[PDB]
Amino acid sequence: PIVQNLQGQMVHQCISPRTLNAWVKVVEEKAFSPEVIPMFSALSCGATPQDLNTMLNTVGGHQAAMQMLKETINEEAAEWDRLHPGPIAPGQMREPRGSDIAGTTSTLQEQIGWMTHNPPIPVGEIYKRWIILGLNKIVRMYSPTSILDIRQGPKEPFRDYVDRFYKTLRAEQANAATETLLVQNANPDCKTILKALGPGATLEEMMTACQG
Amino acid sequence: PIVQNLQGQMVHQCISPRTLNAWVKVVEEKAFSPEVIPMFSALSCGATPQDLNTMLNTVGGHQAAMQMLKETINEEAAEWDRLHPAPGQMREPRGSDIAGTTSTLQEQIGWMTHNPPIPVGEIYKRWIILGLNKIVRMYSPTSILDIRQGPKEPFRDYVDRFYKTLRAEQASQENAATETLLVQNANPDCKTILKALGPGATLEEMMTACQG
Amino acid sequence: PIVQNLQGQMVHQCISPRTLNAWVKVVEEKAFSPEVIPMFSALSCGATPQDLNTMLNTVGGHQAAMQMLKETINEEAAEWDRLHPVHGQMREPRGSDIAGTTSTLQEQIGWMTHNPPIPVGEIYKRWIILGLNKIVRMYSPTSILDIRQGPKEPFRDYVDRFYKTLRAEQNAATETLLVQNANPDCKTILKALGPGATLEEMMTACQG
Amino acid sequence: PIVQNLQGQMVHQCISPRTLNAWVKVVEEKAFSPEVIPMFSALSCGATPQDLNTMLNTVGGHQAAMQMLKETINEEAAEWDRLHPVHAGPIAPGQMREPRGSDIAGTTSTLQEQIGWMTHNPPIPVGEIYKRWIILGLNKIVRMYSPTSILDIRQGPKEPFRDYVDRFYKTLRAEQASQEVKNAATETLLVQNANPDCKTILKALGPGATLEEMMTACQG
Amino acid sequence: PIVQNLQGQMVHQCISPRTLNAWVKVVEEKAFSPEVIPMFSALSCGATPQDLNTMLNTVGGHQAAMQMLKETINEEAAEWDRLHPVMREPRGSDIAGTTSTLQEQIGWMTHNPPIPVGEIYKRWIILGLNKIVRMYSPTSILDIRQGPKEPFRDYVDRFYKTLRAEQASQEKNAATETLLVQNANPDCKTILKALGPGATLEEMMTACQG
Amino acid sequence: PIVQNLQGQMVHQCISPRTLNAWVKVVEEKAFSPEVIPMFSALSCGATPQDLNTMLNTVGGHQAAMQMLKETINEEAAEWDRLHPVHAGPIAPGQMREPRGSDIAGTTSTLQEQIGWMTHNPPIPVGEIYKRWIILGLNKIVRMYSPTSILDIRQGPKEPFRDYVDRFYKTLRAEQASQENAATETLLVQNANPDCKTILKALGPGATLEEMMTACQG
Ligand SMILES: O=C(Cc1c[nH]c2ccc(O)cc12)N[C@@H](Cc1cc(F)cc(F)c1)c1ncccc1-c1ccc(Cl)cc1
Ligand SMILES: O=C(Cc1c[nH]c2ccc(O)cc12)N[C@@H](Cc1cc(F)cc(F)c1)c1ncccc1-c1ccc(Cl)cc1
Ligand SMILES: O=C(Cc1c[nH]c2ccc(O)cc12)N[C@@H](Cc1cc(F)cc(F)c1)c1ncccc1-c1ccc(Cl)cc1
Ligand SMILES: O=C(Cc1c[nH]c2ccc(O)cc12)N[C@@H](Cc1cc(F)cc(F)c1)c1ncccc1-c1ccc(Cl)cc1
Ligand SMILES: O=C(Cc1c[nH]c2ccc(O)cc12)N[C@@H](Cc1cc(F)cc(F)c1)c1ncccc1-c1ccc(Cl)cc1
Ligand SMILES: O=C(Cc1c[nH]c2ccc(O)cc12)N[C@@H](Cc1cc(F)cc(F)c1)c1ncccc1-c1ccc(Cl)cc1
């Protein structure tokens, strides 16, 4: 990653072993639960495209998701070569192509130069956005149940049902329709009390009333 | 977060992997026990709104509580807007800017390091801690009125359960009214000794009298 | 806490996660064994009152001890106010300012880095260590007068229990009690040694 | 390794105990799975040849693969000597002598020489060149430890499609040394070796379907 | 500790939590084996008298040994006062940290010429810990004798591990070379004396390698 | 150890608890296997003679090997005193006194003297000199501790060829103490099983180990 030397200077640093191991352990233990994405973005703070490819490469399993990730990266790189289609002025740098942002045709020197340019170009941030777009698709794919099939059990507490509802909703959406769907699929007892509270009630109010 | 450079300038640093893992471990091992809130505040020292959202996003389960937290944040942001309705006049943040939904990292750093500053991270953390206090209270299993000393339970263990329950029910907020409930719900043998101690006794004297 | 940077100035640092975790694990492992107190003083090196309240707040159990601690802190703050009554001059802290209930972080830093300093962090830690001493003495399972060498207990094990018990509660009186509560065999060997025997001599004469 | 100073100058730092122990654990746990190679490269960021030799020396077992690695490095060193022979004679003041293949591999060079090469203006990256040779030898080891051919990866009658694709592309990664390869034949081989139920659904999708569409169709 | 900064200056740092934890675990695992002493010396690198008292205070058990350590420290402190009778020079209680503030300890340690109160106190502690390792040593060196079926390597292992606790890690002496051969089993005893005098341990062990 | 500060100067730094615990662990878990030696050299990077003695002092067991190590250090120190005699007289201003063998081994030198030699211009690397002596003794320990001989390593009946080569070069590493050949190449083919040995000769002359293990893959 490109961090800050105490001279306010932007220098390149090696990815720490602690960060490498952290990202690896997150994937092995959490698979593609929705919270893996914000953990990836946080662990890749200030990363060059080379750092992002290093992080994706250290993943041992989940090679089906990784191939899907590549196919998303290639479709975003194609769009970049459209919206931002040779001599190079002194003190300046070339313009990046989609393969340069993904790190398939660019070097660490070219990436560092783009990210420390006084007219800067954040190829690491552009690449990370493409990666997160693909990770969203993978999280949607790995979600076992649709939001429509989340229904409160007969003897299941309302808290545990809302836990499953919003965790499913997080994976899918990687609003009034969600509120109507939440009350509609509560068990018939809890359901009636939710209808009796009236509309526009906060989630805190619904859960303390359904606590019986 | 925003930290101090050896050049004396407030600079932005990436949230460390050890801090991310410590916060995830706390939530997984303690859920919403009262002591989680001070640990959250300590682990988010100097945090920007983006850093606070990263910490909240790394929470795996408890999505009912997370949605409740969003509703509290939404209400605090709305009240902030109602309470905050020149060449070079800086644009001041709205509730959504403080919460980080409509503001960039660069804008958040601008407010926090301005002269005079607007501590959007400290403001946002105040809203989060309020919502976490609500969650801790709702998650508290037992009422303080139901904490009663067992016939063979040592007085110290009873007081441990009592004050830990009181902490969850008041969400760690600050009484002889608690002293009377503590004496009233002690078992008959200890209650007699506590009555004989006279009023206004310290807790240290009370537990030394009920040790035999 | 307050540490020094590379310009000779005292700068404020965020409390570190490894320090926080170390203090939590100390309370979970050692409860209120006497050695918990010096560990607290070492982990709170340079702490502001805000940092001291953070460390105490991260304790999960032992809430009976924590309430006792608040009562000790309250009495120390009241005594500070009694000894510092109100009369270019800097405002001086109240007892609640040292304890962090009525002072902001900037006020605590301003006091701790003033010339000359008012070390509200070290004053507060003093009050806290006073309270921990009472908790450790409370948690002490047995009185020192009841620590007695078993008829088949090695003299070294008896001395280990003796001095660990004395530490939680707190010299010629202790040497008298140590010899007096030994079993009749070791007691005879210790009395035959006479006065002026070190603990090393006493433990050697009874090592059999 | 050689890292940027807080002045901003390339200085030598000792290899850290955390980096050393990390590399030892990845080999004890993962052996020579394909993802071990990008982990080796990441843990040896900025490494000198001496550092690279230290990491290779901490491997306790797998000595057959380590001898193979030595032989691969020897062939790359000989090739370096054929393309970059050292001009004999005295070295100009303020200059470094030209490195031979054994200097890059760290057998006939000192730590002080390796530092002088890597921090020279312009730098001669003896550490990066040596790591390139090491990764070439590691590619061979990954293939040797992954015997199962991609042609023998077949979805079980009740194996979930996602697990079958996991085994497929993990086997392909070892065979192809983690090299990005766009090829239609390997994507038709994936459909070809799916089980009867999913293979019917995949053919009912039509040709030229993305992996996301295929895994969604066989999600049942 | 008093350690080098980055600007070439000696400054005071707080004792590290990782250092405190390492010292606690060492005592828990090894008790008072001889190798505990060099571990204590390494973990107390640059320590002030306050840091040394902090480390000793984190020891939970072993309070019999800790009281003996206090008695050794008091003897060394009393001998310091007798050898330094009355720039205020530190008394024994100042070196041990019972009557000295942290600022006074730093004032002595960083003076020119310095008075290293941390190193002096560490010497007293190590002298006291050596007496504890010796007293807690289970066996005397004279009772280490090679088993009839015991490999010679295993006998030499027990001999020097016992001699280390006995001679409290102090330094090939003639009596120890004769005692090692004298207490070997009659078979290897013959092979050793056949080699003659002044043989290396590598030659004694290769001969009796079995 | 001696490390570089932000003034480009070499300064003394305390040895870290991570380094001490790491060295203790590799000895407890791997004794004196050949891979222990490069681990000692990496963890002692930049070490003064005092640091090197600390690491050796943290070894609890293996005291027979540690006494052999002392006798190897004593013989290297005596050879240093023969080849580098100390000259009598006062020490020139701004210079260090000449180190003798016991100074390099840290028995008669102070830490400040060790720092003085290691940071002088030009530097006398007494830590690197001492470490070489230690590694010489440790190599003699790896060979004495080695159980099997390279001659007695023969391939089993149904044992895969890769497992036989694994055991072959691991034993060879202990016999040479990580020191590195048609001699070892012919001992590898001679001590194989008759099924693979036949195919090994048919491979031809000077075949690479890759070609050899692919020829006896099954
Ligand atoms: O919204 C999410 C993702 C999410 C998590 N759980 C879900 C269930 C369904 C679903 O569709 C999405 C999600 N993250 C939040 C942070 C957050 C997380 C949490 F767990 C609890 C909080 F209070 C806040 C966020 N990230 C980036 C920028 C802004 C905000 C944000 C948004 C709204 C407010 Cl009021 C404030 C900030
Ligand atoms: O009071 C609490 C929360 C709490 C914890 N346990 C409870 C059980 C029931 C309950 O209702 C609330 C709580 N925190 C304290 C710190 C503390 C924690 C502790 F454990 C023991 C101490 F001595 C002090 C605190 N935080 C922020 C600012 C000031 C103070 C404070 C307050 C009063 C004093 Cl005298 C001093 C400081
Ligand atoms: O040679 C060894 C020791 C060793 C290990 N295993 C053995 C089995 C028998 C045996 O006799 C000795 C040994 N280390 C190597 C590093 C290495 C280790 C490995 F595992 C695999 C590699 F490719 C390289 C080395 N160290 C210091 C300086 C230079 C070289 C070196 C040597 C030859 C090349 Cl081509 C390049 C560098
Ligand atoms: O491709 C691989 C190795 C790999 C892993 N699994 C495989 C299965 C078979 C196979 O032949 C090779 C491999 N590394 C990638 C990074 C990556 C890894 C991953 F897991 C998932 C991603 F989306 C991206 C890479 N490294 C260095 C430079 C560029 C790129 C690259 C390539 C293509 C795109 Cl679109 C973008 C970047
Ligand atoms: O005295 C204690 C607490 C203690 C521990 N165990 C006990 C059993 C009963 C009991 O009443 C109190 C205690 N700490 C000591 C440090 C120490 C700890 C130890 F374990 C062994 C040592 F040699 C020294 C200390 N701390 C702060 C300042 C000065 C000294 C001090 C005191 C006397 C000497 Cl001669 C030197 C320094
Ligand atoms: O001597 C010891 C203690 C010791 C350990 N084991 C023992 C068994 C019986 C016994 O009486 C004492 C001891 N430490 C040594 C270091 C060492 C440790 C080791 F294990 C193996 C080595 F080669 C060297 C040492 N420390 C401080 C200063 C100088 C030296 C020193 C001494 C002699 C040489 Cl030639 C070189 C340095």
Task: Out of 3.30.530.20, 3.30.70.1520, 1.10.375.10, 3.10.20.30, select the CATH number for domain B2-139.
Answer: 1.10.375.10
Which chain E residues are Cβ-neighbours of C35 within 8 angstroms? 57-60
Binding site membership of B130 for ligand 1 (Cβ less than 6 Å): no
Instruction: Give the Å distance between the CA of C23 and the centre of ligand 2.
Output: 16
CB B50 within 8 A of CB B110: no
- H or E stretch covering F190: helix F182-190
CB contact under 8 A, A162 and B63: yes
CB F56 within 8 A of CB F134: yes
CB proximity list for A10: less than 8 A, separation 6 or greater: A2, A3, A4, A115, A116
Task: Out of 3.30.70.260, 2.40.50.140, 1.10.375.10, 3.40.50.720, select the CATH number for domain A2-142.
Answer: 1.10.375.10
How far A22 CA sits from the closest chain D CA (Å)? Answer: 12
In order, the DSSP letters of F104-164 are HTTSS--HHHHHHHHHSSS---HHHHHHHHHHHHHHHHHHHH--S-STT----SS--HHHH
CB contact under 8 A, D11 and F4: yes
- H or E stretch covering D33: none
CB proximity list for D126: less than 8 A, separation 6 or greater: D48, D49, D99, D103, D104, D109, D114, D117, D118
Six-digit token pair at B13? 């640093």
Tell me the three state secondary structure of residue C198. coil
Q: Taking Cα atoms as reference points, which of A168, A128, A171, A176 lies closest to residue A149?
A: A168
How far apart (Å, rounded) are the C-alpha atoms in residues D41 and D47? Answer: 9
Of F14, F58, F64, nearest to E46 by CB-CB distance is F14
**To test ligand 1's pocket by mutation, which of A164, A165, A169, A172 has the most ligand atoms within 8 angstroms of CB?**
A169
Homologous superfamily of domain range E2-136: Human Immunodeficiency Virus Type 1 Capsid Protein (1.10.375.10)
Query: Which other chains touch chain B, taking contact as 3+ CB pairs less than 8 Å apart?
Result: A, C
CB C32 within 8 A of CB C135: yes
Smallest-distance ligand from the CA of C67:
2
- H or E stretch covering F166: helix F161-176
Binding site membership of D176 for ligand 3 (Cβ less than 6 Å): no
CB contact under 8 A, D11 and F18: no
In order, the DSSP letters of chain B are -EEE-TTS-EEE-PPPHHHHHHHHHHHHHHTT-TTHHHHHHHHTTT--HHHHHHHHHT--S-HHHHHHHHHHHHHHHHHHHHH---TTPPPPP-HHHHHTSS--HHHHHHHHTSSS---HHHHHHHHHHHHHHHHHHHH--S-GGG----TTS-HHHHHHHHHHHHHHHHTT---HHHHHHHHHTS-HHHHHHHHHT-TT--HHHHHHHT--
CB D77 within 8 A of CB D159: no
CB B94 within 8 A of CB B76: no
Q: Taking Cα atoms as reference points, which of F43, F46, F49, F50 lies closest to residue F22?
A: F43
Six-digit token pair at F79? 């050879």
Q: Taking Cα atoms as reference points, which of F126, F138, F119 lies closest to residue F51?
A: F126
- H or E stretch covering C16: none
Smallest-distance ligand from the CA of B165:
2
Of C15, C66, C71, nearest to B202 by CB-CB distance is C71
Which residue type, as a one-letter code, is found at position E96?
A
CA distances from E53 to C35, C38, E45, E97 (A): 12, 9, 14, 7
Distance of CA C143 to the CA centre of its chain: 19
CA distances from B68 to B77, F73, F212 (A): 14, 70, 66
Residue A13 burial (CB count, 10 A): 16
Q: Taking Cα atoms as reference points, which of A188, C62, E60 lies closest to residue B163?
A: C62
Exposure string (b/e) for E23-43, b if CB count within 10 Å is 16 or more?
A: bbebbeeeebbbbbbbbbbbb
Q: Which residue of E has its CA nearest to C45?
A: E14
Instruction: Give the Å distance between the CA of E169 and the centre of ligand 3.
Output: 36
CB contact under 8 A, F166 and D59: no
CB E31 within 8 A of CB E136: yes
* Chain C residues in contact with chain E using a Cβ-Cβ cutoff of 8 Å: 1, 3-4, 6, 18-19, 22, 30, 33, 35, 38-39, 41-43, 45-46, 156, 159-160, 162-164, 167, 198-200, 203-204
Six-digit token pair at A13? 């640093």
Question: In angstroms, what is the resolution?
Answer: 2.2
Tell me the three state secondary structure of residue A142. helix
Helix orientation angle between D126-145 and D49-57, rounded to the nearest 10 degrees: 30
Experimental method of this PDB entry = X-ray
Give the torsion sign (CA, E8, E12, E16, E22): positive
Query: Which other chains touch chain F, taking contact as 3+ CB pairs less than 8 Å apart?
Result: D, E
Six-digit token pair at B137? 């209270």
In the block, residue with structure tokens 């606690």: E24
In the block, residue with structure tokens 């009557």: E99
Tell me the three state secondary structure of residue D84. coil
Exposure string (b/e) for E86-97, b if CB count within 10 Å is 16 or more?
A: eeeebbbbbbbb
Radius of gyration of chain C (CA): 23
Ligand 2 pocket list (CB less than 6 A): B 163, 166-167, 170, 172-173; C 53, 56-57, 59, 63, 66, 69-70, 73-74, 99-101
Query: Which other chains touch chain D, taking contact as 3+ CB pairs less than 8 Å apart?
Result: A, F
Identify the residue whose C-alpha is closest to ligand 2 atom 3. B172
How far C59 CA sits from the closest chain E CA (Å)? Answer: 18
Six-digit token pair at E63? 């309070």
CB C20 within 8 A of CB C29: no
Which chain C residues are Cβ-neighbours of E138 within 8 angstroms? none
Six-digit token pair at E205? 């062990």
CATH code, F2-145: 1.10.375.10
Query: Is the peptide bond preceding residue D90 cis, with omega within 30 degrees of 0?
Result: no
Q: Taking Cα atoms as reference points, which of B38, B28, B25, B33 lies closest to residue B61?
A: B28
CB B99 within 8 A of CB B77: yes
E18 annotated as a binding-site residue: yes
Query: Is the peptide bond preceding residue D122 cis, with omega within 30 degrees of 0?
Result: yes
Six-digit token pair at C120? 């509200």
CA distances from A122 to A4, A39, A101, D76 (A): 15, 20, 9, 37
**To test ligand 1's pocket by mutation, which of A139, A150, A166 has the most ligand atoms within 8 angstroms of CB?**
A166
In the block, residue with structure tokens 């006493």: C202
**To test ligand 2's pocket by mutation, which of C23, C53, C59 has the most ligand atoms within 8 angstroms of CB?**
C53
CA distances from A207 to B140, B207, D63, E163 (A): 14, 39, 62, 72
CB proximity list for C88: less than 8 A, separation 6 or greater: none
CB F209 within 8 A of CB D71: yes
How far apart (Å, rounded) are the C-alpha atoms in residues A75 and D211? Answer: 13
| Minimum-distance ligand 4 atom for the alpha carbon of D169 | 8
